[PDB]
């Protein structure tokens, strides 16, 4: 069982090397063990969503809504077919370009609100 | 970022992810579309095509993948074998598909599951 695909494959590859080293020499160097552990931690960190995306994905899983990871810009797709929605981190697929650009403009936002 | 809202440290945490998912999926509705998985030894393709035709009689857009290729509506979306999850994702992520009929060969299940 794995939690991260690359991390799981790396652990599977490293287990046989560790066992072969043990059968050949009776022990495995601690430096190699810590190197493999650091590599696994780096793999876990690399293939990790942000806390906002993590929280939204956890809520979707709790509600039984399917979710998949798109391969373009860290976009998460919820649902299937015509009933699908997309989020990046907090922006949804229904968030407007005009609203975001106006919010980014401090003076334009102030003028509009005034 | 709603990080400071889900862990205030001086008050009650708020379910921001729940509000986001309520915005994305208003009612008690998931993002699922009807999925019909056809498996077997000798009649997967014919059954898949017949199911697609029958559902096409209803006014619905049917995305189905068979051994011949992947079809969305009346037009061919992709050529090749297309009997694994790598072709099921094409149907399940299309914004126009309302019903998915997937021919599930044993090779795809053995290789990478459903």
């Amino acid at each position: 069982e794995y939690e991260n695909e690359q991390a799981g494959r790396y652990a599977a590859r490293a287990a046989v090397r560790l066992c072969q080293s043990i059968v050949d020499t009776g022990t495995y160097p601690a430096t190699e063990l810590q190197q493999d552990l650091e590599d696994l931690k780096e793999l876990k960190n690399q293939a990790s969503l942000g806390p906002s995306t993590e929280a939204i994905v956890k809520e979707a899983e709790a509600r039984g809504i399917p979710w998949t990871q798109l391969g373009a810009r860290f976009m998460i797709q919820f649902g299937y077919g015509v009933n699908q929605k997309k989020i990046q981190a907090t922006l949804s697929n229904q968030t407007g370009i005009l609203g975001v650009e106006l919010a980014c403009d401090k003076e334009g936002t102030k003028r509009i609100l005034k | 970022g709603f990080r400071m809202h889900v862990a205030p440290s001086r008050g009650l945490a708020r379910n921001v992810a729940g509000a986001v998912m309520d915005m994305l999926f208003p009612g008690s509705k998931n993002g699922r579309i009807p999925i019909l998985s056809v498996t077997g030894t000798n009649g997967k393709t014919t059954t898949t095509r017949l199911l697609a035709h029958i559902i096409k009689q209803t006014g619905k857009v049917v995305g189905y993948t068979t051994t011949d290729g992947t079809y969305i509506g009346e037009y061919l979306a992709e050529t090749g074998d297309n009997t694994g999850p790598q072709s099921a994702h094409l149907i399940l992520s299309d914004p126009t598909v309302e019903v998915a009929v997937l021919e599930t060969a044993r090779g795809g299940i053995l290789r990478s599951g459903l």
């Binding site: 942000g50 906002s52 981190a89 907090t90 | 970022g1 990080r3």
Partner: peptide, 4 residues
């Protein structure tokens, strides 16, 4: 940038 992102998460504001």
């Amino acid at each position: 940038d992102d998460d504001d």
